[PDB]
């Protein structure tokens, strides 16, 4: 079963190659220096149990297409981000590396296009987005002189506006 | 709702953090997304999302009451208050800047190079020579220093006009407000 | 506290800072508060 998780890691590096093609178990077992006997049969019982929960997708026919989000281009990034922001928002650090070129040229391809890449989440997360509408450039003195508490003065705001009216 | 609140909040994000701006935009749905559903969709850290939501709640933008039931954060975007909150924020701001302008016109006006002791314009009799004409300091008879800044030579300031202009988009958006709805 | 408010620091940071400020002021007024910690002089001697 551990050798099975190792095969999963192998097909993950296979994705990293980008030459992913419909395969089967025998060729992988050969290239990973392992044999084809009844041991392969019991580990294939385990492997079908895996096919019941293969978040790393291992289907029986034409398969292995793990990434739930997977396209490969700058136009691909643009359009997937577009449709997802029609859905509204999304993006994680793992999505690009699982879907596309190896974890470089992606922050680059993001900063290069009109997309001002959104890396606003935590140090290990990049919620990609392209922002079109203008965040109103406000002077920092105006940006933080705007800080007047008004934290719980609801009725007070009502009456104060009624006063200045 | 209407285009009023949409454009309003869209331009209101511009003041707070852009990390708060994405969360505000998520109000695209008024569906009152729950905190854990937000973790699924916004995916910001539970601590970061908590801080962001609390900061957005404090200024009376949104109101949240998770009931008990899995618990469901009663997310919202209270639009009726939103307009008044923005109006008061600019209302106080326009006041503070004009008061800062007027309060900046008062200064001692004089100094001595040594002894660095500003006096006042009123001290002219003490700080003067019947003969030499040059104003001389009291405990050091060696002053020549007039005014470090002469006066408001410029008009009121480029600061007040700069607020007027940089906020013309906000003024225009509140003109688009135009009280579309007379409801509570 | 002034710098935290200037920077717009975390609300909980400002709350704890205000709590400590209140503690310091109340302790300066009276160091014998009921059921509250005593402010030492870095040597175990309570301040007067
Ligand atoms: Zn002098």
Curated annotation (Swiss-Prot), chain A:
Changing residue 113 to Y: In TTD6; reduction in the levels of both TFIIE-alpha and TFIIE-beta subunits of the TFIIE complex in patient cells; reduced phosphorylation of TFIIE-alpha observed in patient cells. GO terms for cellular component: cytosol; nucleoplasm; transcription factor TFIID complex; transcription factor TFIIE complex. Residues 1-72 bind DNA. GO terms for biological process: transcription by RNA polymerase II; transcription initiation at RNA polymerase II promoter. The keyword Heme does not apply. It comes from the Eukaryota. Keywords: Acetylation, Disease variant, DNA-binding, Nucleus, Phosphoprotein, Transcription, Transcription regulation. The keyword Translocase does not apply. It is found in: Nucleus. GO terms for molecular function: DNA binding; RNA binding; RNA polymerase II general transcription initiation factor activity. Belongs to the TFIIE beta subunit family. It is linked to Trichothiodystrophy 6, non-photosensitive: A form of trichothiodystrophy, a disease characterized by sulfur-deficient brittle hair and multisystem variable abnormalities. The spectrum of clinical features varies from mild disease with only hair involvement to severe disease with cutaneous, neurologic and profound developmental defects. Ichthyosis, intellectual and developmental disabilities, decreased fertility, abnormal characteristics at birth, ocular abnormalities, short stature, and infections are common manifestations. Recruits TFIIH to the initiation complex and stimulates the RNA polymerase II C-terminal domain kinase and DNA-dependent ATPase activities of TFIIH. Both TFIIH and TFIIE are required for promoter clearance by RNA polymerase. This is Transcription initiation factor IIE subunit beta. The gene is GTF2E2.
Swiss-Prot record, chain B:
It comes from the Eukaryota. Residues 4-87 form the HTH TFE/IIEalpha-type domain. This is General transcription factor IIE subunit 1. The chain holds residues 11 to 201 of 439 of the full protein. Belongs to the TFIIE alpha subunit family. A zinc finger (C4-type) spans 112-140. The lineage of its organism: Eukaryota, Metazoa, Chordata, Craniata, Vertebrata. Tetramer of two alpha and two beta chains. Interacts with TAF6/TAFII80. Interacts with ATF7IP. Interacts with SND1. Part of TBP-based Pol II pre-initiation complex (PIC), in which Pol II core assembles with general transcription factors and other specific initiation factors including GTF2E1, GTF2E2, GTF2F1, GTF2F2, TCEA1, ERCC2, ERCC3, GTF2H2, GTF2H3, GTF2H4, GTF2H5, GTF2A1, GTF2A2, GTF2B and TBP; this large multi-subunit PIC complex mediates DNA unwinding and targets Pol II core to the transcription start site where the first phosphodiester bond forms. The modification N6-acetyllysine is found at residue 57. Zn(2+) binds at residues 112, 115, 137, 140. It comes from Homo sapiens. It is found in: Nucleus. Recruits TFIIH to the initiation complex and stimulates the RNA polymerase II C-terminal domain kinase and DNA-dependent ATPase activities of TFIIH. Both TFIIH and TFIIE are required for promoter clearance by RNA polymerase.
Curated annotation (Swiss-Prot), chain C:
The tandem heptapeptide repeats in the C-terminal domain (CTD) can be highly phosphorylated. The phosphorylation activates Pol II. Phosphorylation occurs mainly at residues 'Ser-2' and 'Ser-5' of the heptapeptide repeat and is mediated, at least, by CDK7 and CDK9. POLR2A associated with DNA is specifically phosphorylated at 'Ser-5' of the CTD by CDK7, promoting transcription initiation by triggering dissociation from DNA. Phosphorylated at 'Ser-2', Ser-5' and 'Ser-7' of the CTD by CDK9 (P-TEFb complex), promoting transcription elongation. It is found in: Nucleus; Cytoplasm; Chromosome. The C-terminal domain (CTD) serves as a platform for assembly of factors that regulate transcription initiation, elongation, termination and mRNA processing. It is linked to Neurodevelopmental disorder with hypotonia and variable intellectual and behavioral abnormalities: An autosomal dominant neurodevelopmental disorder characterized by profound infantile-onset hypotonia, developmental delay with poor speech, delayed walking, and impaired intellectual development. Additional variable features include feeding difficulties, dysmorphic features, and visual defects. Catalytic core component of RNA polymerase II (Pol II), a DNA-dependent RNA polymerase which synthesizes mRNA precursors and many functional non-coding RNAs using the four ribonucleoside triphosphates as substrates. Pol II-mediated transcription cycle proceeds through transcription initiation, transcription elongation and transcription termination stages. Belongs to the RNA polymerase beta' chain family. This is DNA-directed RNA polymerase II subunit RPB1. It comes from Homo sapiens (Human). The gene is POLR2A.
């Amino acid at each position: 079963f551990g050798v099975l998780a190792k095969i999963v890691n192998y097909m993950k590096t296979r994705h990293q190659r980008g030459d992913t093609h419909p395969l089967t178990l025998d060729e992988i077992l050969d290239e990973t220096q392992h044999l084809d006997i009844g041991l392969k049969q019991k580990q294939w019982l385990m492997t079908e149990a895996l096919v019941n929960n293969p978040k790393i997708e291992v289907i029986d026919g034409k398969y292995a297409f793990k990434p739930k989000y997977n396209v490969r281009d700058k136009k691909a990034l643009l359009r997937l981000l577009d449709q997802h922001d029609q859905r509204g928002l999304g993006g994680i650090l793992l999505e690009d590396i699982e879907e596309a070129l190896p974890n470089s040229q992606k922050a680059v391809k993001a900063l290069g296009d009109q997309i001002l890449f959104v890396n606003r989440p935590d140090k290990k997360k990049i919620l990609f987005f392209n922002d079109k509408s203008c965040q109103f450039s406000v002077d920092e003195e105006f940006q933080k002189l705007w800080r007047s508490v008004t934290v719980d003065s609801m009725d007070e705001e009502k009456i104060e506006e009624y006063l200045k009216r | 709702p209407a285009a009023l609140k949409r454009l309003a909040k869209y331009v209101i994000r511009g003041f707070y953090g852009i990390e708060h701006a994405l969360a505000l935009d998520i109000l695209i749905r008024n569906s009152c997304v729950k905190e854990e559903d937000m973790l699924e969709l916004l995916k910001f850290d539970r601590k970061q999302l908590r801080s962001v939501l609390n900061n957005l709640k404090g200024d009376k933008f949104i109101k949240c009451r998770m009931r008990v039931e899995t618990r469901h954060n009663y997310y919202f975007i209270n639009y009726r208050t939103l307009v008044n909150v923005v109006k008061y924020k600019l209302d106080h701001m326009r006041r503070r800047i004009e008061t800062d302008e007027r309060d900046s016109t008062n200064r001692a006006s004089f100094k001595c190079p040594v002894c660095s002791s500003t006096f006042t314009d009123l001290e002219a009799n003490q700080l003067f020579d019947p003969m030499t004409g040059t104003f001389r300091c009291t405990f050091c008879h060696t002053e020549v220093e007039e005014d470090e800044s002469a006066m408001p030579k410029k008009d009121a300031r480029t600061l007040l006009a700069r607020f007027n202009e940089q906020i013309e988009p906000i003024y225009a958006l509140l003109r688009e407000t135009e009280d579309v709805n007379l409801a509570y | 506290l002034r710098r935290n408010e200037q920077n717009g620091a975390a609300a909980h940071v400002i709350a704890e800072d205000v709590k400590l400020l209140q503690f310091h002021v109340a302790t300066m007024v009276d160091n014998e508060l009921p059921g509250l910690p005593r402010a030492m002089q870095k040597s175990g001697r309570p301040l007067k």
